[PDB]
Amino acid sequence: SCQLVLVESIPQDLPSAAGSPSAQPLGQAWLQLLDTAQESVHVASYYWSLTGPDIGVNDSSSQLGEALLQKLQQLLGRNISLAVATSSPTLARTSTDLQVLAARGAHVRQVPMGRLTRGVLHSKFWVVDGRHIYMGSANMDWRSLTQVKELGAVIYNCSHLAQDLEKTFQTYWVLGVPKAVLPKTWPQNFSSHFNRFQPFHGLFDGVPTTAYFSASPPALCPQGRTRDLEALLAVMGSAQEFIYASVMEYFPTTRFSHPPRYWPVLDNALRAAAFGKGVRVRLLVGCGLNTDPTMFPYLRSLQALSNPAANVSVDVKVFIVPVGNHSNIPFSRVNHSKFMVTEKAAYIGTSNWSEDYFSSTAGVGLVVTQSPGAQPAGATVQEQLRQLFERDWSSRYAVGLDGQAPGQDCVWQG
Amino acid sequence: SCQLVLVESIPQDLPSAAGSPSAQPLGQAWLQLLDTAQESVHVASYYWSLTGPDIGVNDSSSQLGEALLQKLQQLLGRNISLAVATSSPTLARTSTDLQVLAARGAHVRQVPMGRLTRGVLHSKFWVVDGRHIYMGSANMDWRSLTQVKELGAVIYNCSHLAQDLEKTFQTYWVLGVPKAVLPKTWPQNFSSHFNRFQPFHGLFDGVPTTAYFSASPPALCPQGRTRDLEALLAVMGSAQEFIYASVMEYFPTTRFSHPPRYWPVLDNALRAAAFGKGVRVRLLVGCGLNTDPTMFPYLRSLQALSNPAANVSVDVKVFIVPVGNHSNIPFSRVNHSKFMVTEKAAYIGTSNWSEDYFSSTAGVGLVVTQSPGAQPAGATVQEQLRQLFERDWSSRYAVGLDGQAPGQDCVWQG
Amino acid sequence: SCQLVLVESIPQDLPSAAGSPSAQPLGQAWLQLLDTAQESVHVASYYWSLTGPDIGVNDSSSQLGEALLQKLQQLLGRNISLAVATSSPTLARTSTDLQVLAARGAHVRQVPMGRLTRGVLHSKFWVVDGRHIYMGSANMDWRSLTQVKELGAVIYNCSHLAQDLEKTFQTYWVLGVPKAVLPKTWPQNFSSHFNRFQPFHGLFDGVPTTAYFSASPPALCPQGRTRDLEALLAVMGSAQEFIYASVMEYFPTTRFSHPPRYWPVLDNALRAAAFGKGVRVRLLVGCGLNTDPTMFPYLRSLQALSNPAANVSVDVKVFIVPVGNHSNIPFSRVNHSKFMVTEKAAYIGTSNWSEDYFSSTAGVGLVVTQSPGAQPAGATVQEQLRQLFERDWSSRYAVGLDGQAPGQDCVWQG
Amino acid sequence: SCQLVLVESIPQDLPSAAGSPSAQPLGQAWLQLLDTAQESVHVASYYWSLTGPDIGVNDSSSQLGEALLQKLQQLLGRNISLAVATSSPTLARTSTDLQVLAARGAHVRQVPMGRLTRGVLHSKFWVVDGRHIYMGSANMDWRSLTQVKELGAVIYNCSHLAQDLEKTFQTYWVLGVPKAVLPKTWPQNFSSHFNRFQPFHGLFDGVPTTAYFSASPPALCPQGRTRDLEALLAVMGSAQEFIYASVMEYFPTTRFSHPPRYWPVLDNALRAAAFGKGVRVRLLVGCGLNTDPTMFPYLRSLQALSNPAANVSVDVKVFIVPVGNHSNIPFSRVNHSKFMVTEKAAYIGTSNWSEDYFSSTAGVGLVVTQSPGAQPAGATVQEQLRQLFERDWSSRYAVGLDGQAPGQDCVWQG
Numbered sequence A, B, C, D: 001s002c003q004l005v006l007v008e009s010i011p012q013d014l015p016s017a018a019g020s021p022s023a024q025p026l027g028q029a030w031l032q033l034l035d036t037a038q039e040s041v042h043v044a045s046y047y048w049s050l051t052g053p054d055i056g057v058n059d060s061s062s063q064l065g066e067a068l069l070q071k072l073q074q075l076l077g078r079n080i081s082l083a084v085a086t087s088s089p090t091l092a093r094t095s096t097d098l099q100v101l102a103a104r105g106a107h108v109r110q111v112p113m114g115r116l117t118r119g120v121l122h123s124k125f126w127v128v129d130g131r132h133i134y135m136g137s138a139n140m141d142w143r144s145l146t147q148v149k150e151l152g153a154v155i156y157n158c159s160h161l162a163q164d165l166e167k168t169f170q171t172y173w174v175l176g177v178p179k180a181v182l183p184k185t186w187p188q189n190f191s192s193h194f195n196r197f198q199p200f201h202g203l204f205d206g207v208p209t210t211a212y213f214s215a216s217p218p219a220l221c222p223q224g225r226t227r228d229l230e231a232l233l234a235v236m237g238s239a240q241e242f243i244y245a246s247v248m249e250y251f252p253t254t255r256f257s258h259p260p261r262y263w264p265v266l267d268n269a270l271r272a273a274a275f276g277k278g279v280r281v282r283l284l285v286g287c288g289l290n291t292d293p294t295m296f297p298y299l300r301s302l303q304a305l306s307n308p309a310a311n312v313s314v315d316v317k318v319f320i321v322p323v324g325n326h327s328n329i330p331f332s333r334v335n336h337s338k339f340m341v342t343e344k345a346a347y348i349g350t351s352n353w354s355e356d357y358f359s360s361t362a363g364v365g366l367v368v369t370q371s372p373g374a375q376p377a378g379a380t381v382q383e384q385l386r387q388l389f390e391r392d393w394s395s396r397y398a399v400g401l402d403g404q405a406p407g408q409d410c411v412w413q414g
């Protein structure tokens, strides 16, 4: 009785066009998921910034944040197991949510991801009651609920996939023991029973569905677990009609490893598809006050690939979120959705598109494919993702690379 | 002793800027080579169009081709061996000079490159007496001597490199036997002594020099021989200051196979060098009345990586040649140069930069490295090649990609 | 619902020690597999010698072959498709069984492996109904059932792996078309799913299992398929406790190509494992009346590495089979088992250990790894193979390399 | 006017059979070389123990070393430049010869080979006045003159070979500057002009002669320098009649590394030659009280390939130097010769046969080919080396691998 529902977070003061597709809000989904929890809650997060005073700002947009924190506290008051895995080189170093939760009774382990592979634990997912899971780009932060546009997937009553994700969470947990090292071969406990060529077949609300989970980096991939890079490559290469993708930040270079090197894999896979198979490739990126201006030339090259007379169609746009009054809060008002949708499959990832995210930085992602079933009224997951992507593109917040009119709130040329 | 002098052909009515560097004319070098011939002449060519009537055009510019054919016939009259290897799917269908030479007593073999690897014999080199060797992007054609602009290299009196290229020609020759098949392995008699790791060593006019030869496709590459792709990639990677390249066509895809596919090897190498190593990259391409307009989008994409702030600098310009009154002569008034210049190497080759030239189509490439010697007067071959490239780059006939203007001679999309 | 059961055949007049481990007889498994067939039977074989008179000798041991042929004819009677792939240079020329089945309605095709890759089709496997497979060294011959020691593996109700093997069978079938050549690249039809990197996960009778296949020569290996030599090297390298191997022929040299060469790849792998990793290595070799006496120098050289003090233990034994009153049967009374078992994987192949078997002839392999299940169940396939190897090793028919008894049977020094 | 002289040192109490061939004594050649030099002397050595008190032993066999040290001091008196390159982790640590020479005025520079490449400076050669050279296995030790059997080569009045060895010694000296690292690419001068494909031709005493130098490790090989491993492989492969080799120790493994690995390159080359070419392969490994007993299994494995019926001859023996009354002297009474003999060439090296000497430990080697001249009076160098090897082989001091008589003063089993 697996149930899959798309979930996303719309930032404050970001009205959409009339009659536009939409999914369930993120805060309501998280609150309901935590309410339905009865045995244990496992969460892997990059950082915790649930309350406003953690950052140091005084705003009314963190109400959902401390509501979530007090919900966590009252859940801990009901004698429910709670495990948190977080990266040792955390982001918000002034927050006290982890200490408060640990004092209340939860167990928190800091994964030394920066020492093991010179990276960070970017994975963000939940495993609630060993039956319900959440997967998406959102972080444990009020900004991700009210300021940053998110997109994720939450699954209910799907024990097999829940245990599949729990295996990865257990790898993270056992890596969090003090003075731990990477096992050469992972034991026969973390091996995944579902992968790219043997997906989990099920009937999601009477609709056939094939799903599997991808993990990264390769050093943390147990036997039988498909890597994130190969899942992405398979999704892109299996395309026959179009490839609609949207990431917060994308360029074919290594960022935090010196010396910098070219990483042309995802770009080559895009150009090869768009040329050989003639698939309409559309790419969305996020532009904000913290955006690196050096990213744009690569996007301009990809746009320059376009040639309608030769059946090569590549289009690249950027996403602008108007800051408006919300200028005091840092690292907000950014399109943080990371996913692509094909006419066949639908990939919902966590990591960005760079060498480090697929070689050094821990990540996770899931691929689903809902073939049409016995209910003509029902719409498949890929159709919903495509509708959301088209709503994003048709919105006035998406500006082409050529358009650099004043008033846009991002660095642009820089 | 080895001598090395660059040779290039300047088309009629194509004056250069005052004070520009020059080189030895191609026709004079060919006549000198034929005059110095005393034992045997081995020629590997794509097609033969020496006479004006062979094409069918009544023009006075073919007088030099007539003189060259007369010199060849005179050489054949002095009991001098002349072996010619040509591709089976030739181009000048209506040519009769080869038949005349065969009647005079020359040995000609039609290499069945079409039925062997689905390609052609694009290699255009020249071995005289086993000592003097010419190689460049110039076919045995009068328009290639007075109407088209190429650049080749002739090496005098120096026998070991001549023997190496003679081994390559012997592979081409043994492939010319009727009803011959591609050997699975090559005998020891076909094995190049010099490669990337162990290049030839010599003192060229009192100046130290290292050189070696490359061949393609890998099917016709015996043990020890370096592939053209390998040599090009090594030359690109070794460079740390600048990379100057001139080619008639630059297609990052296949050109004649079905279905077409992306081949980003050269593009990836160029981008990786220009980004990681901070190497200045300049690319010059040829324009003609018969040119595929789909090449331009890839050139624009490569040009788009032009952010000077991040130490990345790529520039692309096209090189046109005015038609003038020579509209009657077909497939002429184009830039035929095919070479790469770096600060430590100078690649001169006969193949274009598409996939088939390195996968199926036969070709030969020469990489020559020179260093400042004891003498303080002369300049290295790299310096001369760089000066010639700069002269072409600063010429009025070279315009930018966005330099489309009325009166040009490119196809220019459309 | 896959079920893997190890199968083997014990020759008559070859008693074993009391209480020795034993597996399912080969004849019963073959008869059951034929009986369960209802859609189609695909068999790839080296030669066909089902009937006793085909060889030319009458014996009571041919009754099993007669029964097998009768079963096959009965299957042909019930409108059951039967496709047969056989090498063009067959071994037993006097074989009327193939003609009988062709008259009855078979689809025998002669693969010209001799002309294509200068080899033979040594593959021996069945694909029954597209769900059940058989893999082993037993080519269909009454001598194999009654007079030759054999070992193989049969898998039931495992349709995915059956399709994976049907891919290789379809490769052989396509190569069997008259006037056919090796394609430069195999189509996407024949691309495999499971290799050493992503094996096939399954719960075989309540026990976790990972399995995949191999193919040879590399010319006939499509995309995504692991080479037989590569799989063998991976299995050898991964082993950390012991390596037990039993083959008919082990030659570190090319066996049929002229001029002879040295191919130390397998020998180097064995020595490197036994030295660097300190793994016990045991080698068992069948020794019939047709074995080449030049075998023994290499086996003695491998044995000479035995140094118990320096943690380098290598043992080699020779397994002879008594002849007795079965001398009239040619090409019989041998040990045809070709497999290697380690502490983490079990390899069952259909080819010997020589350069030709991995570069010129066609063969397939099967690598199975079983983990101890949660239930006690029985024993893993690796444990069963190890027990069989120990039973063979401790048998009186197995002798040391220096124990050449006068009353033995093999050629020994010749 | 180059002259090549083979020099060897027979230790005390080591008689030879009547009529045995012999060469010039090493000490006499060294004294003559030191006397001849009048401009500069360059030496490279593993260690410096020229006097008995350096080790701490009083014996009459140190008089030669003391006389050599006195000769060096006298040469320093005549104001002759003398440079020394030695490994930082030198074997002898209580010696004071280097300090005495430095106090006299000679420049001594330590080469930190143990830090740059985790190896030692095993090279042993001299360059006097840039016209005469010496290369052999003898160190700057009186034991190498009186208590160790040694072989070396001395070249007189040869400018070009002296210059090449001067380039090698100059690389060694440049590395010796304090706080230095391996240059990414060596400057122009360090490049060599003679390699295995372009040897230095000359009329050595009136007969034709081709020779070239080799160097190791690859980190210390400039452009145009043939790697000594490549030289060994070439002289082994080019063999067609016999391969006579004599080394102190022979391990197809890694001696000083962690974890140890199997290194079969030389073993594979020897076996491939002996099998494919049918070349009589002979080995002469030195044995002594300090010999590692773990080498013998590899020698037994090599010898077990012997098969006169199939034209394989891999006979292996061991050389034993009797201790006699010289038990007090440590690290002495061993065969330290390192050379290879062939009907074509004659390799002389300064390193044993192990992965360390070709991966990390530095070393040099000289390859000399002497074609027969017009005058048959002068025996070629290959003939002399073969005669010396035969004299050592047929001597009573050489014992087969099966001979383990108690009075043999060797380790054998241990």
Ligand SMILES: *[C@@H]1O[C@H](CO)[C@@H](O[C@@H]2O[C@H](CO)[C@@H](O)[C@H](O)[C@H]2NC(C)=O)[C@H](O)[C@H]1NC(C)=O
Pocket (backbone or CB within 6 Å): A003, A156, A157
């Ligand atoms: C997951 O399954 C459980 C049990 O099958 C569902 O819980 C039931 O939900 C229905 C619908 O509201 C109630 O009428 C039942 O009383 C519930 N039973 C129990 C034992 O809780 C649950 O709703 C399912 N999950 C989701 C998201 O629907």
Ligand SMILES: *[C@@H]1O[C@H](CO)[C@@H](O[C@@H]2O[C@H](CO)[C@@H](O)[C@H](O)[C@H]2NC(C)=O)[C@H](O)[C@H]1NC(C)=O
Pocket (backbone or CB within 6 Å): A309, A310, A311
């Ligand atoms: C771009 O794609 C279109 C769509 O296929 C091509 O137009 C025709 O498509 C049909 C589809 O059945 C083909 O049978 C035709 O061969 C296609 N061409 C023509 C001229 O009808 C179009 O040709 C493609 N563009 C290029 C440059 O090939």
Ligand SMILES: *[C@@H]1O[C@H](CO)[C@@H](O[C@@H]2O[C@H](CO)[C@@H](O)[C@H](O)[C@H]2NC(C)=O)[C@H](O)[C@H]1NC(C)=O
Pocket (backbone or CB within 6 Å): B036, B156, B157
């Ligand atoms: C190749 O070398 C020969 C001699 O080694 C050159 O011949 C000489 O050339 C010079 C200049 O052209 C003349 O002054 C001499 O009289 C020639 N001598 C002989 C014996 O021929 C020859 O020119 C060289 N090749 C080239 C192409 O220059």
Ligand SMILES: *[C@@H]1O[C@H](CO)[C@@H](O[C@@H]2O[C@H](CO)[C@@H](O)[C@H](O)[C@H]2NC(C)=O)[C@H](O)[C@H]1NC(C)=O
Pocket (backbone or CB within 6 Å): C077, C078, C079
């Ligand atoms: C399938 O099997 C049936 C028998 O079970 C075959 O039936 C016979 O066919 C022949 C003609 O080929 C008739 O003369 C017989 O009378 C049939 N026997 C029956 C109907 O019992 C049938 O031909 C087979 N299918 C084929 C080969 O097409």
Ligand SMILES: *[C@@H]1O[C@H](CO)[C@@H](O[C@@H]2O[C@H](CO)[C@@H](O)[C@H](O)[C@H]2NC(C)=O)[C@H](O)[C@H]1NC(C)=O
Pocket (backbone or CB within 6 Å): C003, C036, C156, C157
């Ligand atoms: C493979 O699957 C078939 C069913 O498709 C199995 O056949 C059943 O086996 C059970 C247990 O022996 C019997 O109780 C049933 O009556 C069988 N049904 C049929 C229709 O035959 C079979 O046992 C499985 N294993 C094999 C063939 O090895």
Ligand SMILES: *[C@@H]1O[C@H](CO)[C@@H](O[C@@H]2O[C@H](CO)[C@@H](O)[C@H](O)[C@H]2NC(C)=O)[C@H](O)[C@H]1NC(C)=O
Pocket (backbone or CB within 6 Å): C278, C309, C310, C311
């Ligand atoms: C052979 O291997 C065993 C273990 O694989 C080695 O035993 C170890 O020896 C070292 C030093 O002698 C001890 O520190 C370890 O505790 C031992 N381990 C075990 C499990 O016993 C043995 O030394 C090896 N033999 C040789 C000659 O190296």
Ligand SMILES: *[C@@H]1O[C@H](CO)[C@@H](O[C@@H]2O[C@H](CO)[C@@H](O)[C@H](O)[C@H]2NC(C)=O)[C@H](O)[C@H]1NC(C)=O
Pocket (backbone or CB within 6 Å): D310, D311
């Ligand atoms: C082993 O070497 C011998 C040579 O001693 C080979 O004998 C050959 O006999 C044939 C018969 O006329 C002749 O070619 C020569 O007398 C020998 N050949 C050579 C090359 O010397 C014998 O054939 C060899 N055995 C092998 C290669 O298996």
Ligand SMILES: *[C@@H]1O[C@H](CO)[C@@H](O)[C@H](O)[C@H]1NC(C)=O
Pocket (backbone or CB within 6 Å): A058, A059
């Ligand atoms: C935050 O702002 C509100 C509204 O002005 C104010 O009442 C409150 O005291 C502020 N809190 C802090 C900690 O500054």
Ligand SMILES: *[C@@H]1O[C@H](CO)[C@@H](O)[C@H](O)[C@H]1NC(C)=O
Pocket (backbone or CB within 6 Å): A077, A078, A079
């Ligand atoms: C939780 O457990 C404590 C003791 O461990 C107990 O006092 C308390 O009542 C429990 N609360 C719930 C909600 O189970």
Ligand SMILES: *[C@@H]1O[C@H](CO)[C@@H](O)[C@H](O)[C@H]1NC(C)=O
Pocket (backbone or CB within 6 Å): A187, A188, A189
């Ligand atoms: C693997 O899981 C089982 C329970 O399923 C447990 O008993 C065992 O200890 C686990 N292995 C490791 C290495 O933790």
Ligand SMILES: *[C@@H]1O[C@H](CO)[C@@H](O)[C@H](O)[C@H]1NC(C)=O
Pocket (backbone or CB within 6 Å): A013, A324, A325
């Ligand atoms: C932002 O500031 C403007 C100007 O005062 C105000 O009209 C608007 O309501 C503010 N937006 C908020 C408070 O969300």
Ligand SMILES: *[C@@H]1O[C@H](CO)[C@@H](O)[C@H](O)[C@H]1NC(C)=O
Pocket (backbone or CB within 6 Å): B058
């Ligand atoms: C070519 O043109 C010349 C004059 O331009 C003329 O004399 C000659 O006859 C022409 N020949 C041909 C074949 O057209």
Ligand SMILES: *[C@@H]1O[C@H](CO)[C@@H](O)[C@H](O)[C@H]1NC(C)=O
Pocket (backbone or CB within 6 Å): B078, B079
């Ligand atoms: C050259 O060829 C001609 C024609 O076959 C012949 O007559 C002559 O003898 C040959 N040799 C010479 C001219 O030295």
Ligand SMILES: *[C@@H]1O[C@H](CO)[C@@H](O)[C@H](O)[C@H]1NC(C)=O
Pocket (backbone or CB within 6 Å): B187, B189, B190
């Ligand atoms: C090398 O061997 C081939 C093999 O037949 C032969 O055709 C060729 O002429 C030989 N080359 C020589 C001997 O230079």
Ligand SMILES: *[C@@H]1O[C@H](CO)[C@@H](O)[C@H](O)[C@H]1NC(C)=O
Pocket (backbone or CB within 6 Å): B278, B309, B310, B311
């Ligand atoms: C790279 O660029 C930075 C500033 O953009 C500059 O400081 C630096 O010198 C550049 N690198 C080199 C090698 O010049």
Ligand SMILES: *[C@@H]1O[C@H](CO)[C@@H](O)[C@H](O)[C@H]1NC(C)=O
Pocket (backbone or CB within 6 Å): B013, B324, B325
């Ligand atoms: C073309 O012809 C015209 C008139 O005949 C002449 O003025 C011009 O110079 C010619 N151009 C060339 C390039 O010869």
